[PDB]
Amino acid sequence: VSVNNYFYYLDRIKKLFTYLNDLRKHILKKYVYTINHKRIAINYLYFSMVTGLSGAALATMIRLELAHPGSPFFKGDSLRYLQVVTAHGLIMVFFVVVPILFGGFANFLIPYHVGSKDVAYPRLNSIGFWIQPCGYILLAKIGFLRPQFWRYYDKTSFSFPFLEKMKYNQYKEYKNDYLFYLDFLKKEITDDHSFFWKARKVIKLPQYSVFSFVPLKLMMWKTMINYPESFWYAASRVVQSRRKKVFVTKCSARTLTTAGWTFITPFSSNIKYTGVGSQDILILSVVFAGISTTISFTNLLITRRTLAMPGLRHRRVLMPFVTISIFLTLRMLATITPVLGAAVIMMAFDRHWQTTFFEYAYGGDPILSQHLFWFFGHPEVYVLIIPTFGFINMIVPHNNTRRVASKHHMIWAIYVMAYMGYLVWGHHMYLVGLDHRSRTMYSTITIMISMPATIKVVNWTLSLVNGALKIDLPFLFSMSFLLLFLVAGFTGMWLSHVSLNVSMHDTFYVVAHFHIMLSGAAMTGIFSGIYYYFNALFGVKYSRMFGYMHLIYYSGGQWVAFVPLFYLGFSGMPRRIHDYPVVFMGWHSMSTTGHFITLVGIIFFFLMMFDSHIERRASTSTTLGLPRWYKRISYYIFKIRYLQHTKSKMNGIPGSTVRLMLINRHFVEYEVYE
Amino acid sequence: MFFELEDIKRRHSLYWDIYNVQGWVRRPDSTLYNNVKRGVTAGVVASLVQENITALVENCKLLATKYEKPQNLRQAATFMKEVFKLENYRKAVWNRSQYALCIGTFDIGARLATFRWLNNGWQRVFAGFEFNFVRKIPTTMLAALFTAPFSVPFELARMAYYGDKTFPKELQRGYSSYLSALARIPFEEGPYFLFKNSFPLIIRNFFQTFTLFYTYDFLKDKASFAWRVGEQNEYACKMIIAGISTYLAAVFSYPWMVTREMVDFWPKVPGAPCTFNGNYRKAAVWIWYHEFSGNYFAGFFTKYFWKASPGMFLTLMLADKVGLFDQTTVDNFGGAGNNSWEDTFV
Amino acid sequence: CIYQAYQNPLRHINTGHNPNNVYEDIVMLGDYPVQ
Amino acid sequence: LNHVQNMLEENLKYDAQKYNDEVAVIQKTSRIYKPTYTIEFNREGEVLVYSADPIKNSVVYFKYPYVLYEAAIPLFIWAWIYNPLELSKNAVNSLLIYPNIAWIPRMWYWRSLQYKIQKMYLLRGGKVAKIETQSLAGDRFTSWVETYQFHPLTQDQKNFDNQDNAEFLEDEGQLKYELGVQLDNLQEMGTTSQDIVINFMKEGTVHHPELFEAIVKGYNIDTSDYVINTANNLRAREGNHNH
Amino acid sequence: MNYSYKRYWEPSTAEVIGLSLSVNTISAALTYPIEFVKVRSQIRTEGVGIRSKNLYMGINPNKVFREIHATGNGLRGFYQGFESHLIGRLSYLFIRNLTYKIIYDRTKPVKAHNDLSHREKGVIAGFAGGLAAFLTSPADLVNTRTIAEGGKPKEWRWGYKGLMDGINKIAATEGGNAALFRGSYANVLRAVILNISLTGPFDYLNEKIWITFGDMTWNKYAALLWASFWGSVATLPFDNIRTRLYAQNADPTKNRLTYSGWADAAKKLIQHEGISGFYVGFYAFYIRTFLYAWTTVFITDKITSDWKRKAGLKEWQI
Amino acid sequence: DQLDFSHFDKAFENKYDIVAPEFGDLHQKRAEFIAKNQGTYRPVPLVPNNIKGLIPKTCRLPATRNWYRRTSSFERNGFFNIHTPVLNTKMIPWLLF
Amino acid sequence: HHHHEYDWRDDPKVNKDIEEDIRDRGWHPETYDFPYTKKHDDWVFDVTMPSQNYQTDLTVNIHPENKKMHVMKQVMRQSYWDAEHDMAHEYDYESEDLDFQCESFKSQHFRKKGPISQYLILGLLPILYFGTEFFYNHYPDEDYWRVAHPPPLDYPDTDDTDDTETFKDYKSFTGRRMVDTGIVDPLWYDIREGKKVYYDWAGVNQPMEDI
Numbered sequence A: 001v002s003v004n005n006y007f008y009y010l011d012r013i014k015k016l017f018t019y020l021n022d023l024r025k026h027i028l029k030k031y032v033y034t035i036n037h038k039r040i041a042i043n044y045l046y047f048s049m050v051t052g053l054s055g056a057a058l059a060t061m062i063r064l065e066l067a068h069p070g071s072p073f074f075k076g077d078s079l080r081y082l083q084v085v086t087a088h089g090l091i092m093v094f095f096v097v098v099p100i101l102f103g104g105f106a107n108f109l110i111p112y113h114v115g116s117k118d119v120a121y122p123r124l125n126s127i128g129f130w131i132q133p134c135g136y137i138l139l140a141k142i143g144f145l146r147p148q149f150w151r152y153y154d155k156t157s158f159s160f161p162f163l164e165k166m167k168y169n170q171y172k173e174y175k176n177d178y179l180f181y182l183d184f185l186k187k188e189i190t191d192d193h194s195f196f197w198k199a200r201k202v203i204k205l206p207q208y209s210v211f212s213f214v215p216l217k218l219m220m221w222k223t224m225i226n227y228p229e230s231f232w233y234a235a236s237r238v239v240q241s242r243r244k245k246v247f248v249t250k251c252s253a254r255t256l257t258t259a260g261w262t263f264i265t266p267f268s269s270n271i272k273y274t275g276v277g278s279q280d281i282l283i284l285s286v287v288f289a290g291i292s293t294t295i296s297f298t299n300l301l302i303t304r305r306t307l308a309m310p311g312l313r314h315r316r317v318l319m320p321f322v323t324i325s326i327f328l329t330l331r332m333l334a335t336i337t338p339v340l341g342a343a344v345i346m347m348a349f350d351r352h353w354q355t356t357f358f359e360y361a362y363g364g365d366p367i368l369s370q371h372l373f374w375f376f377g378h379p380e381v382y383v384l385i386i387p388t389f390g391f392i393n394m395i396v397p398h399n400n401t402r403r404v405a406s407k408h409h410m411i412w413a414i415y416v417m418a419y420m421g422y423l424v425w426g427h428h429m430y431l432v433g434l435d436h437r438s439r440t441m442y443s444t445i446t447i448m449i450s451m452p453a454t455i456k457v458v459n460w461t462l463s464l465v466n467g468a469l470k471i472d473l474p475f476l477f478s479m480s481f482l483l484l485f486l487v488a489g490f491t492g493m494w495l496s497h498v499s500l501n502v503s504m505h506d507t508f509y510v511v512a513h514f515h516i517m518l519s520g521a522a523m524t525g526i527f528s529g530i531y532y533y534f535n536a537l538f539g540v541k542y543s544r545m546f547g548y549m550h551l552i553y554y555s556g557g558q559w560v561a562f563v564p565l566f567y568l569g570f571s572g573m574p575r576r577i578h579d580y581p582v583v584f585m586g587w588h589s590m591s592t593t594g595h596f597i598t599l600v601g602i603i604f605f606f607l608m609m610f611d612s613h614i615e616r617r618a619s620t621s622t623t624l625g626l627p628r629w630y631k632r633i634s635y636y637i638f639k640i641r642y643l644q645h646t647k648s649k650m651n652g653i654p655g656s657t658v659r660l661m662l663i664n665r666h667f668v669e670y671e672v673y674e
Numbered sequence B: 001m002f003f004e005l006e007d008i009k010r011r012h013s014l015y016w017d018i019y020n021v022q023g024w025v026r027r028p029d030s031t032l033y034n035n036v037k038r039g040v041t042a043g044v045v046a047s048l049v050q051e052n053i054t055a056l057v058e059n060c061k062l063l064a065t066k067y068e069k070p071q072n073l074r075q076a077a078t079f080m081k082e083v084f085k086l087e088n089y090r091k092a093v094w095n096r097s098q099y100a101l102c103i104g105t106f107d108i109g110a111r112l113a114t115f116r117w118l119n120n121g122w123q124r125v126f127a128g129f130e131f132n133f134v135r136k137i138p139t140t141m142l143a144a145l146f147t148a149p150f151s152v153p154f155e156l157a158r159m160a161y162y163g164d165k166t167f168p169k170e171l172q173r174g175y176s177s178y179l180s181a182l183a184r185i186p187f188e189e190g191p192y193f194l195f196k197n198s199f200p201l202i203i204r205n206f207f208q209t210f211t212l213f214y215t216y217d218f219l220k221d222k223a224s225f226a227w228r229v230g231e232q233n234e235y236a237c238k239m240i241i242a243g244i245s246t247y248l249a250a251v252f253s254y255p256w257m258v259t260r261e262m263v264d265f266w267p268k269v270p271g272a273p274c275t276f277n278g279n280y281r282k283a284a285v286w287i288w289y290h291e292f293s294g295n296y297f298a299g300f301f302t303k304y305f306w307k308a309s310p311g312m313f314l315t316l317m318l319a320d321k322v323g324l325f326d327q328t329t330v331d332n333f334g335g336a337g338n339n340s341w342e343d344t345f346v
Numbered sequence C: 001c002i003y004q005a006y007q008n009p010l011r012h013i014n015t016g017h018n019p020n021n022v023y024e025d026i027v028m029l030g031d032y033p034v035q
Numbered sequence D: 001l002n003h004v005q006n007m008l009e010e011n012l013k014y015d016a017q018k019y020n021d022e023v024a025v026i027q028k029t030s031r032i033y034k035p036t037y038t039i040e041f042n043r044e045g046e047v048l049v050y051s052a053d054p055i056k057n058s059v060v061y062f063k064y065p066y067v068l069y070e071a072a073i074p075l076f077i078w079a080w081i082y083n084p085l086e087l088s089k090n091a092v093n094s095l096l097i098y099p100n101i102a103w104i105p106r107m108w109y110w111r112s113l114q115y116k117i118q119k120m121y122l123l124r125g126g127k128v129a130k131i132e133t134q135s136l137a138g139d140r141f142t143s144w145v146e147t148y149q150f151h152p153l154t155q156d157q158k159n160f161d162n163q164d165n166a167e168f169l170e171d172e173g174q175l176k177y178e179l180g181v182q183l184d185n186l187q188e189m190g191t192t193s194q195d196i197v198i199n200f201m202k203e204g205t206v207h208h209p210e211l212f213e214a215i216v217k218g219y220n221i222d223t224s225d226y227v228i229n230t231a232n233n234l235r236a237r238e239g240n241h242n243h
Numbered sequence E: 001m002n003y004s005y006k007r008y009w010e011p012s013t014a015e016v017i018g019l020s021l022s023v024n025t026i027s028a029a030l031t032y033p034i035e036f037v038k039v040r041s042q043i044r045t046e047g048v049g050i051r052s053k054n055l056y057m058g059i060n061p062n063k064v065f066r067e068i069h070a071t072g073n074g075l076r077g078f079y080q081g082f083e084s085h086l087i088g089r090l091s092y093l094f095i096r097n098l099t100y101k102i103i104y105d106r107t108k109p110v111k112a113h114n115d116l117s118h119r120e121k122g123v124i125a126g127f128a129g130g131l132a133a134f135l136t137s138p139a140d141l142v143n144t145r146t147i148a149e150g151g152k153p154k155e156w157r158w159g160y161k162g163l164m165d166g167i168n169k170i171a172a173t174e175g176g177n178a179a180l181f182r183g184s185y186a187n188v189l190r191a192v193i194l195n196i197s198l199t200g201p202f203d204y205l206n207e208k209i210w211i212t213f214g215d216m217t218w219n220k221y222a223a224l225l226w227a228s229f230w231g232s233v234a235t236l237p238f239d240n241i242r243t244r245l246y247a248q249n250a251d252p253t254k255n256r257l258t259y260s261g262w263a264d265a266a267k268k269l270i271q272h273e274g275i276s277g278f279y280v281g282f283y284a285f286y287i288r289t290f291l292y293a294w295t296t297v298f299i300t301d302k303i304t305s306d307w308k309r310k311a312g313l314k315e316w317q318i
Numbered sequence F: 001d002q003l004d005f006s007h008f009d010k011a012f013e014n015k016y017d018i019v020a021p022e023f024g025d026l027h028q029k030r031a032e033f034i035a036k037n038q039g040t041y042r043p044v045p046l047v048p049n050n051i052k053g054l055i056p057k058t059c060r061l062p063a064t065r066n067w068y069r070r071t072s073s074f075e076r077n078g079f080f081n082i083h084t085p086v087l088n089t090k091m092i093p094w095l096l097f
Numbered sequence G: 001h002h003h004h005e006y007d008w009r010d011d012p013k014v015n016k017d018i019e020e021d022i023r024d025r026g027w028h029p030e031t032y033d034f035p036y037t038k039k040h041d042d043w044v045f046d047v048t049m050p051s052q053n054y055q056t057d058l059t060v061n062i063h064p065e066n067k068k069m070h071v072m073k074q075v076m077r078q079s080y081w082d083a084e085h086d087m088a089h090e091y092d093y094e095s096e097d098l099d100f101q102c103e104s105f106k107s108q109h110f111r112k113k114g115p116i117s118q119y120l121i122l123g124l125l126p127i128l129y130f131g132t133e134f135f136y137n138h139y140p141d142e143d144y145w146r147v148a149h150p151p152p153l154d155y156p157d158t159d160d161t162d163d164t165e166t167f168k169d170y171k172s173f174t175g176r177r178m179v180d181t182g183i184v185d186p187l188w189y190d191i192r193e194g195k196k197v198y199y200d201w202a203g204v205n206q207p208m209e210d211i
């Protein structure tokens, strides 16, 4: 019969609560404790997006600081500018590109491309995926957090008196000595358990023998009787004074700064030069990053050596270019990581134990630290730029339905470039003044490195030709990546000249070279691979209009921000400068505008992701299961299927004749009729 | 004190900064009356030109439907004279002049005044280009959204005034002029007829205004190097910028009218519900989801590009002449531009 | 597992492995299987 | 937007509906011609009708319209170089515009040369005609077109000639003039283009002329009496006197 | 921020009453169709709720307005509810304003830079609004009974020709003025929620904008928009419940679901529509509230600025 | 009866009465005539029939009389093709500059 | 498996409050199964190519330009997850189930889409985060984003701003001579009463008052 339960509302509430509990359990299972490679890669990609947003914000702040001569943004905080520059560099290099590329691409593809079940150590993969956030956060908080916490207008003098434990040292003597302790009780009170603030203002008050300069915020100790807060509340912004002078020193802690991406000794390797703070934080973050990189490299390389499929045991030519580049870069990272870790440990020991590991006085030499950093330096960039070439090569072959130009030659060239990258250490330290033989050897090795790159460019160009071009959004990104890589190679080759390098070492030319090589080529290739594999990663087809807008604004912004930088480099603008002469204002403003356009393009890409999520339409492989028409029957079948799918898709669209008639009769606004 | 909500007035202390010419400070010349007058003048001129061009084009189309295309230069001159001789063309000139006065008085001028009220404060760089290119991005979008539907009433009035003469005179409501129709029909059919599913017009106007304003501002700020590094005339540069902006606006705007026509002109399939269901917003969605983009761009040049793009170009040129694109620029290191003279000569 | 008994107690020595409000251990807190 | 009414719009909608309902893809044919000779189609079931080498019969290097601009470019080059008028830098740059555009007429003429039907064949069934041409870069492009797509033009080419009763050939079969014919839609390289005018030159040879006239008239031919020629005398991309 | 206030000059009670009357009349006239549509929408899905998924969810205010216009009365049919709702709005505003003015006169801090705290001001405003809305429950029911007859069957229609005729019919058929207070507690709760969901967020956003963007001109409008959104989110279930209650016709067979009170109405809505049933027409309600707030704020602020300038307060004091 | 979602009941009907025309009786009569004469009564704009110096238009002329070669073309399947041989030819010039 | 009972409010044809997604007219994702096995496309003719055999019909001509209208076939909308059933499918009965894979291919965890509002945040994430680093955090300084207003007259002191003294420097002949030299630009403001009125030519708004 009918049941009259008083609260169907409570029934529905119980249903909702059960839904919430089951949702929490399912979220913990498939998004927290999951060992799925796809889920781990998706999480890593989201974290990488967040980190890249933070890095782009740091870059935008740097660009705003450099926009106008006279330090309009940072207000002369040179230490803050240096910290922000180091933070941007580290977050983009060690926390954005490496995290995104390694985590996302490897986790998504190694299960598929290498054809292995999950990862070699799924527990380690999950551990690294969950561990990257700590370093991500740590490296991004240095610019806003400093040991000198008080503000420039913060009158720390009012509160620091309470921090002084030496004020009551006298009673410390009689704490364990009671024979004459009462004698100390016979003294006259002057500053015992009392605080007398000297007159902070010129008060001409004849009737007042004493003027209480005590903080008004601490008048009634009863209020402070239970407040579990420090006295800094009285010291935090209790004055209306402001010093809007660029000459006014806003730090007074000049030793507290950062030493950029490459730690430069002894400036970084001395407490007198680099105070306790950002330097130590960066060293610890580098140690953590090295541990995480070792973990990731073990998890990746262990599978490739062991978990290979029955047919992909040794013939690496069969694997995709992106996966081959992944394996090669993993080996390269496994090479230099121990050296980087040892160098970081030595730098930390010098900073905190004073081993004189960089002091020229009793045996040390900053050249050793510079050489170690460079031995970690050039291979890092070489490994970083490697995967994007494989991504572009994989994107191009499917779009043109043709075989690659020279797969074996390209693989061998990549391996040779990786081998050669271990011998360009002296190239980045040409001005350090090494032995002329060493400088000549370094220059000769640097010049010879371009031999593999030309092979790759020729192979890409040749594979792009004599094919069946099917233009997709991915193809335009690959073309943009190739165009960006064209200029960077020329800039690097020009910088390889000894005289030109001596004329432009550590300048805006080098800054432009580095940015166009990394920010342009690598990020463009990452975006291309994202668009090339948008379906498998997201499950829905991409949004054509917003994707085109992103590919347009992002490609233009890179050139817009790198052309003025190269122009200033030809004018000899020093790198890592907080301000410049007025002669550089035009180029600086152009670079800043380019950076803003790049930010707008990033916003457009985010809107593209949102639109793709709102679209919810299934994607169809343009190859239709036949990426190569290696046979006439295959070509005929592809043509027939394409014609059928076109006829089905072009259904309900008005016919050619009817559309022409309507278009011709469109104008229907006449004055007088018959 | 009067309603549930309250906007409490709170006093605050003053502020001081080193520089003072890099933010958004409303121009003293940016006043309501002056902005309204300049926008009205520019819009009226541009609308009059566009309407005269549209009338001439329609008369030429009618003549071509009546007589063969000219065979020589002399034949072209004769055909042009014959077309110009049309009393239908004269009546169209009068009606389009009325409609153009109405539209450029209320749509182009309104959009220009809104842009002036929204982009008055953004000062430029003393020795370069405006690096804060995203500062006015929200201002331009909001300003375009403000005046996006201002022209739909006049457009609907014109369409109805030219749409009733096609029906028999037994159902003719008069409409001696465009102004007469605009005066009578609102008191006859109700305002809702002039604002019934005007989404295509609203979207087209919004997109056109946003494209024109943003592109013109970005080009004027960024391309100054072409008039600074290179010693160009900058007048051909202004004209080229106007042309590029007009082409971009047309490309970004024609899809709304294309969707409206597809909803209202595609032959309906017997025995099925309407694919767009008669809202046409899905049409835009279909336009935003169509696989063949060109399918939503057919006849773009033929249908409306030759009728409104010249108006937009003329409006941009007239705005440049009226100086409505003026953005302040002061030396960030000299005199009024700074408050700390120490870090300027040492 | 609040108000929905997904888990069965007879197969679980220590009921309460997940946050739930519709379960109770068969072995009571004052229960003791003795010989 | 449908709230406003226009009787022109209503008539247009009614006409569109009528066209979509009545005008169908399947259409009956009436212009049918029965030839006066049994036709011996080639090994590929084709009978040749017109063979021509217009490139061999064209003035390529020294053309009428292109020569004037091609020579006048040096005058503008000299004027810009010597600054004879003593103008400004911007005026000189403007004067430099002329040389950058001179290639357009020559390119247009060369492209126009490609549209000439070098070879014409009729396949079995008398419904599709294969027209083969060669782009001046030596690009041999062939296309099959429907029989109904042809419409003759006048000898003056200023007005569309009547689809029937046209006399564009001599009595013996040779063409009376260099003829132009319009095709509504031609699928060149798979891409359909609308309203394209092709030309058959008088220098061509009208093999089996009668059917050619039927191809010119556009009427469908009754391919009843057909023989097969077993002679693979044509090679893959065989060299031709037209080059 | 406690001493940050700026109340150097104070308005008089009569001028405040007159300005409130004029501005509220203008704002209600502007928002009359919006309120009528929002009331009509809530009757349409009183037992169906939002059955659409993801972005399709909610009731299309554009579609509702299109249907209302196509009903045949056109734009002229958008003031039938406004005929009586205006008087009730004016009465509620007058009562709340008198109570709040008396309270503020009896408890204002001496310093013009010092005002009653957020909690105290909210309490006073909530008391005034609750009293005022408890006063005008009959007017709310009468105005609601007019618009509700359109989406309801003609047999189930109540048949009110306006304010006085509707009042007489209600006092006759429904038993008496006791039925006039059906849902009076709901109206009081709606006003109280409205009385406290605006000033807090408005002041918070205004101060945040002042700190982040200086004393810019967009601060007032941005704070108004944020406060309107927050107040609409807060009071949305209360307004829906009050409408569904005051709309309850006498004939039980003529009611889709029977509501014996706020608890019964909420239980039935949760059983049928669920939690999302309280978010019906949220966009339309927010639009109406924001429009009324913008009109009233602009008019009253302009009038007050003119009055203060006449009074001669300093440029910083104005 | 009510609250029985298995079969819909008239109590759930939300239908607004259609009182009068939305735009007016003139619009109603015009709509009636249009639905009655759609494709039947075809008014034509007034044009002077005799025009000295202008040969009357009698039929469609061949494409050789056009004053401008359009780029976009119409594929008979209903497509609006931009990539055409004429498009390639026109794109060859500017790319050279 | 299995499903619920009949409800007229759940039928879009009955309930008038259901808005039909024009991009999802012919597709009903609720009918999609894992793995999908519904055929939805085959060889279709008689749209532009007649299905009859007119290969050698001299009396029949095919006119591809006169194709009749057809029904638009919307693309397959992405599947929406039936969370409840999925919550049952992915549920775990701990310490009573062996860690083995069910033989059925239906046991494969097919990732189906759900609500979209979360991704909406990803649309505004680049903006919000930016504000988080610039507005909420007030980096690099509080005044960097504040409205620009110059300091008042002799505020905070004549050492930092001796504007009145500047007026004296602008009143002497030598400074006047400097103006004649053109090297020093004209005065940036004028001292009116005790206030500094910046002329409209200065391009800077009026200095904030001392409240």
Ligand code: HEA
Pocket: A381, A382, A384, A385, A427, A428, A429, A446, A447, A449, A450, A453, A454, A457, A485, A486, A488, A489, A490, A492, A493, A495, A496, A497, A501, A505, A506, A510, A513, A514, A515, A517, A518
């Ligand atoms: C992923 C990033 C990346 C890549 C791929 C490269 C690639 C190269 N780099 Fe470098 N480089 C950096 C990132 C990179 N670099 C960074 C970050 C620094 C600064 C470190 C610091 O801050 O100090 C740096 C610094 C740096 C310096 C010194 C700057 C300084 O003093 O510190 C030099 C000079 O020898 C150099 C050279 C090269 C060369 C010769 C290549 C070659 O691999 C590329 C050359 C290859 C080609 C030339 C092939 C292109 C093919 C063509 C056929 C081009 C010809 C085309 C035309 C002329 C049209 N790089």
Ligand code: HEA
Pocket: A048, A049, A050, A051, A052, A053, A055, A056, A059, A060, A062, A063, A066, A085, A086, A088, A089, A090, A092, A093, A097, A259, A260, A261, A262, A511, A515, A518, A519, A523, A526, A527, A530, A561, A574, A575, A576, A577, A595, A598, A599, A602
């Ligand atoms: C790969 C590393 C990388 C990247 C991407 C960038 C990107 C940018 N960098 Fe730089 N930069 C460095 C590495 C990088 N940089 C290093 C190593 C230094 C020197 C450190 C040192 O001095 O020691 C440096 C120094 C440096 C300076 C110091 C100035 C000077 O030395 O005088 C400046 C100032 O303009 C600058 C500007 C920029 C700008 C404006 C961008 C813009 O491109 C920012 C645009 C944003 C991105 C390119 C990120 C993409 C955003 C995402 C969210 C991707 C996620 C989305 C997807 C899934 C694709 N950078």
Ligand SMILES: [Cu+2]
Pocket: A377, A378, A379, A381, A424, A427, A428
């Ligand atoms: Cu290197």
Ligand SMILES: [Mg+2]
Pocket: A428, A431, A505, A506
């Ligand atoms: Mg150096």
